[PDB]
């Protein structure tokens, strides 16, 4: 299952701190954050989801955490938002 899970979400668990940017080239600089009804200037970071499937060890750890039953809805949401090899997530893109 971990080997199959790698081929499904390998490299696709990346995201920029602001939803506007989709790749790492654009995800650089500063942006205005409009969370909690308050503006703030924050740097743009091309981050990765905490639990991913980049290789087989990370896939095994993610599947173990899912099997324990902890945080698996968030991993499911991240997997559903998966779009492409090196692009930021799109909401409910691949619900299958």
């Amino acid at each position: 299952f971990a080997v199959i899970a790698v081929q499904l979400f390998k490299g696709k668990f990346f995201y920029c701190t602001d939803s506007s940017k989709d790749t790492e080239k654009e995800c650089i600089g500063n942006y205005v954050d409009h969370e909690k009804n308050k503006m703030e200037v924050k740097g743009r970071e091309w981050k990765r989801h905490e639990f991913h499937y980049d290789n087989i060890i990370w896939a095994l750890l993610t599947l173990f955490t899912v099997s324990t039953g902890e945080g698996w809805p968030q991993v499911l949401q991240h997997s559903v938002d998966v779009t492409e090899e090196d692009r930021g997530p799109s909401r409910s893109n691949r619900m299958e």
Binding site: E50, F51, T65, T68, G69, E70, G71
Partner: protein, 48 residues
Amino acid sequence: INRHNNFRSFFGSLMLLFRSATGEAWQEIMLSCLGEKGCEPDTTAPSG
């Protein structure tokens, strides 16, 4: 790893372990105690 959940004391660590045993956010704790986190200021043992 905050004022509610930390390994600072024996009973705090025991409570953290019980919380993980019931499976609350044990992966979040694992991530929060992973890497190059800032260290508690040591009041004693002066250094340069």
